[PDB]
Design a protein around this ligand. Structure first.
Ligand code: A1EG2
Ligand code: A1EG2
Ligand code: A1EG2
Ligand code: A1EG2
Ligand code: A1EG2
Ligand code: A1EG2
Ligand code: FE2
Ligand code: FE2
Ligand code: FE2
Ligand code: FE2
Ligand code: FE2
Ligand code: FE2
Lengths: 314, 314, 314, 314, 314, 314
């Protein structure tokens, strides 16, 4: 049993809005060091937990968890576009095993994914089509949302399935740490906005995409001007969460509720559920130890950047 | 705290293919007696569990369980076409409660339902828009499928939520008994039928609907000629299942697996999961007793007709 | 959920060797009263546990338990000869359920049965082809033999399966109470005797059957002259066994071993295992009460005659 | 106490149908290395678990487990023929102990065996009459079939008995990995085929044997042409099963059912039950360590070749 | 299950030494009433627990418990002399069952009993040869002695055996209440009395018997003159013991030790162990209630007279 | 605390009937090596468990266990005769402690013992009066017999008492392995034989002793001619028993019953109970390890010779 884990924040505003050059150099160095460690590990399988940003999943059918037997990246915000290499038979076996373990898992054969899925693959693996990948979508924007306990159990089931494959497995978490970007909501929407939310938004014209990107960039700039326009960053909770993950106290997160998390840190903080899943997976491989802890509140981007790694000790 | 339950088989081939007049009169009398009992009960809320037949849910996103905040009937096979009356606030509260209870439940705001949802409402309530209804979708045709234990806990969570509303609740199960009609499969499909299965089946033209209905009718006639063209009916297992449901021994169904059920009775027998859910729900209201048991193997229709009712003992 | 049980000793020496006319009249009256009670009960299914006397099973393959999907009577010792009516689908379902329950059960599609199966059917039901029957063979002559605990678990599994059929079930036990008649053994056999024991004895010529019957009759007459030629009868143990069965203390028989039983009462006493199975079966139907207890040591026949009945107090 | 274990796939199509010379040399080298390790171990007793292919056991009496006190190999598919050296007293003691342990075990004194029993003895020991052997037949072709839990407990009981003999014991599992060759069935049989299935097929004339062998060879050639004529091989499940066996997680196989295994891998995959039994046996001797893992999907033969070994560490 | 119990003090000094006529009439009336109740009960079997007074058991072999398969009365102190009717087969079955239950029981085929056995049979049944009897000897004079817990277990085992005989059983306890008459001891013995104690006391000449009886009578007269020549009577402890027996609190006697009992009440008080056994036996038959309590300290005899009865509640 | 244990088979036919000289030399060498180890240990106390052969205990009183406060060897079959050195105070303390521990132990002050007691003392210690000895008689010829569990508890109680004496204790088991010599029985006896069995056989005349010895010698010679005149030897069960004793798995013998042991190995095999007791005793002293295992089936003597030793690892 050999396993590697790396959790990293993703940000669509790379190049569009930039911090000081020293911060960018430090972030790039951290990412390069993580990539070097991953390349040294030389994985054979990748399991990628990621959220969506109203690009592939809508309110026509909104599942808490989804597994992508076939996935294609649409290439938004400058990210790569194209079809992902997914082993069909292995994915179907994983779906059967997780369904049998007691997890109600949705299955998709044509899953459109966005920068949340594509960016970690480019940054850490070098491309989309390097290593076979199992994509797992976790809902984080549309209420009701899954809890910490169900996410932990999903991660444990996936890790228990993957521990019997006699392969070197790399686990990835793509969610952010703490931020509150302007995200469309169903309750306060208008007619056109409701129509876009209830599906029919997969084939968005380029003009609407440009308008959405411009709105996100402008909101980010206003956040740089002042953090009270959105929910302000919470470094204390981010550090507590990372420390809890490293100390092997993941189960202590079962006491935190969804509304409590939203009040403390913000509505988008739920992306961190991906991280939780990843860590649960590695707990199935035996004893492990962490490394490469990095955190920094970057106001130029909306989120607070974080990165962590773990390795199974054999 | 008052509760009623009625589980009844649904058959699209009512009038298209007919058995002898005597059995038709007997079935109509049983249905009329059940309708009279329901009208005497005078429910205030309806919770309906029903499957789909590749008309509203496809392989783009296939969840095990779904809740319909908004549902519209498509009027296939001569069934009623119209929009179902769903209380939005109650549906959202139910979704939140079931998610918190530990069930991974999908949510849809524009859910297209087939004759499986429409026919019981016409037959027992008298129309689509008589009583407010909470539509619950359970997958029964696309593998992997949910098990008996997860369906039982879904029913228990829904019943636990509804027991606190201070209303008279009627529970319905629309699934049929053991049968095996021709159903398209993803593995053995061709290009066109793979394309229809993955999606684009919501906007199905009328010519394809006519061809599908004609093929179903022809297969039913061949089944009447000989039962070996499909999986033959299994009265023994149907009677065992009904007896287990009546005796309050629902948990004994947790030992039966999906492949075992498919081998014993047929692939479509999984529709009976709806029945299980319904019974679990009534178990949350306290003591109950059953009545109106009826079963008969009708070869003219593909399925074996069944009907059962239960009432809480206040 | 209704059940009846009747256990009765069988004796091939009816008419060949006879006791006084008074005791014969008493036995016939007891049998007639039991038949009247059974006819009043009006059963729908019969589960018959009976042993074999080296007539259908041999040392080519000797199982501890066997289920007969197809059975045919050979008409030995003046008993009826013919084919038993066995429901094939019900028998196969029973075999599947008992196998799944954790009992290693053998199945046979062509089972030859001696007077042990035929005589109770004639005496209690009126004929071989009156009611559908499930024949269950329990080994009692060829070591190693099954214990009391495994026989009890087999009976419990069969009763648990049959309690969900929504029928009226009659359970029968056909073994004797206490005796040790001359039975061929493998250890002390000669060449021809060994050849007959290891199979090849199914199609026995009539001359060998006549010689066997004459030897049994002569041994019975010598036993009438003196009981020390064989193992003497043990009324105390027979009464203890019957009392234990009536008081619902069947599990107390798990402490008794096979060699202890053989030493106390005789090698053939193991036939009573059938009785145990029958009683275990009725324990699956709920509360029951016993009746019709009769015991008498008849030295003219080899065994000690006994009879008992039980009814579910619905 | 010291013990050795070796599980190896068997294939009647050795020489009749051949793959490339390189893979044949590789398989021969693996077999030779296993034989060398066994010869170095120098065992004193062999316990051989094996299936049958409708040559020794039929539907006259079909047990789930059988122990051969006397066994003779018939010599089919070019395998060796003749009497097997079985210690009678040791076999009878083993039967008594296993019966007392709570396993319903059949006993045979003239057991006709086939290439499934003979081929491993020739390949790994050098001949049929080298070391005393206890043959254990496990049913794998005729439904209903024993489960994984019952097979595990049978192996545990046999190992517990053999751990007190003060001998060096070698355990063998002759079953193959996932495959599905054409095998006659009872449900779809004709009159002559049913007559052959319900016994009377022990003394098959050479013409019928030639026809059966030719049909098997032709089916193998068609499978080489295309794998969809039968159930295609499943390397994923084979590797999962081997990894589960090596990691000491045999109990996890109790959750898998018979119909689930048949659907996932094929009807003949049940032969792997023999492997399970073998491993359970070694768990009775204390701590053990595995070695010699080899797997390769050979399409030229029907099965997927596998081999594994284990040793008690002292 | 029908059971009766009667415990009564025995005294060899009836007629030899007499109290006032009124108390003699009262004792005779109590005994007559108990005899009338026993005759009304009409028992079928008698189990008699009685002690010995160095007349049948000596230091050659001294067991704590003994069962008499054959017993003969010697007729001392004017008691009846003769052979007791003991069912041999029933006694042997009882011995086997009690030994299997976990009690280390001795057996004797020629047991010489004394007035302790004979007197209750004459007084309560009318003679020695009226009803079949199972004689059980409990040691009470030779140290080391059995405790209360082992005596209770012996009584429970005997009652559990006798509850399956389908007979009406009468239990008797012949031990007396608190007293301490002159009893020879091994430690303080001289040569001749050491020789008599170890053995040769069975064929005791009549002159030694006369001397022993005269010594007992003289000691009784001196005790009448003053109670300090022996251990004085303890009415308080006798009443506590009887109250504990009636209230079903027999287990509370497990805390009392042998030396504590000897110090509190006297060395001969250990005879009451018989009473304990009797009561334990009736606890095996179900619910029971006591009656006929009588106690009186008679100084003219050495012991303190007591009598108690119990009846099962059918 | 320090403890030694040695169990050795005894045989009265030493010199009267002899095997080959090599076998005799090997047996003498094994015995001499055991004697040397015992002499090196230098014990201070000996506890000797032994059976009787109808020489000291008869059916007048037959206890399951007996402790000899005073013992005398009668000198049969050429063994030594005379008084044994027994510490009276220590023996009485042991009797009190064992009685208090919950074992129903008989006590004798004049115990006549035979070659079963005398021969191990001569062979292993050098004489009868070398070391103080506690003799414990265990019944093994007269039914009913004590079981394995009660014998184990007796051994544990004795070891627990002796572990507090601050001495070096040697434990001996004088019983023999599987065999069945001609032994008089009560059931099949005649008038004179019954009279001798029910006592009166202590002071046997020399002529009857000569006749008994001659009959035993003749039966041994016939057994040498053929082993079927008695029960044939069972090396398999003997080796299993020795292996179970060495592996510390003594409690596994609680499942074996008396009749099962008699059927498997023979009536006299019950002598091995002594061995069990011895081993139980050493388990009270802490951790121990075994040595000096020797077994050989000697047909010239009736029994199968065995020898084993163990020491406490301080
Ligand atoms: O694609 C979109 O709609 C924007 C999503 C988005 C916005 C701000 C910060 C983020 O980290 C982020 O993922
Ligand atoms: O609507 C469809 O697509 C056909 C569904 C369907 C087909 C056959 C038998 C049925 O009972 C059934 O519901
Ligand atoms: O049927 C046979 O083959 C003879 C068996 C048999 C022999 C003796 C006494 C019996 O009661 C009995 O059934
Ligand atoms: O011996 C027979 O009857 C054929 C059995 C058989 C057939 C195909 C592939 C196999 O691996 C196999 O064992
Ligand atoms: O029977 C004998 O040998 C004398 C026994 C004895 C002595 C004194 C008081 C008694 O109550 C008693 O029973
Ligand atoms: O001592 C006696 O009276 C004979 C006992 C005896 C007889 C045969 C074989 C033995 O091993 C044995 O101990
Ligand atoms: Fe994000
Ligand atoms: Fe349907
Ligand atoms: Fe019989
Ligand atoms: Fe095979
Ligand atoms: Fe007394
Ligand atoms: Fe002996």
């Amino acid at each position: 049993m050999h396993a590697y884990l790396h959790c990293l924040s993703h940000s669509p505003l790379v190049g569009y809005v930039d911090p000081a050059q020293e911060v960018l150099d430090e972030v790039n160095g951290v990412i390069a060091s993580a990539r070097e460690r991953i390349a040294a590990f030389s994985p054979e399988l990748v399991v990628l937990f990621a959220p969506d940003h109203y690009n592939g999943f809508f309110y026509d059918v909104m599942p808490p968890f989804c597994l992508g037997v076939g996935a294609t990246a649409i290439g938004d915000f400058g990210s790569a576009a194209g079809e992902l290499p997914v082993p069909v038979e292995l994915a179907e076996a994983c779906a059967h095993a997780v369904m049998k373990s007691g997890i109600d898992l949705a299955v998709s054969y044509c899953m459109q994914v966005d920068h949340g899925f594509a960016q970690p693959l480019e940054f850490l693996l070098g491309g989309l089509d390097k290593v076979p990948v199992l994509p797992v979508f976790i809902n984080g924007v549309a209420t009701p949302l899954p809890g910490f306990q169900r996410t932990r159990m999903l991660g444990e089931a996936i890790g228990r399935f993957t521990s019997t494959l006699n392969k070197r497995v790399l686990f990835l978490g793509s969610g952010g740490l703490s931020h509150q970007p302007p995200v469309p909501e169903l309750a306060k929407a208008d007619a056109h906005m409701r129509d876009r939310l209830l599906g029919s938004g997969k084939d968005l014209p380029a003009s609407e995409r440009e308008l959405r990107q411009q709105r996100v960039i402008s909101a980010a700039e206003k956040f740089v001007e002042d953090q009270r326009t959105l929910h302000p960053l919470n470094p204390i909770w981010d550090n507590q969460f990372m420390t809890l993950l490293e100390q092997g106290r993941i189960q202590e997160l079962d006491a935190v509720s969804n509304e409590e998390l939203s009040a403390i840190a913000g509505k988008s903080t739920h992306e961190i559920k991906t991280w939780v899943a990843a860590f649960a997976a590695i707990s199935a491989f035996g004893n492990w130890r962490s490394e490469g802890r990095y955190y920094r509140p970057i106001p130029e981007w909306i989120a607070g950047f974080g990165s962590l790694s773990a390795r199974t000790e054999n």
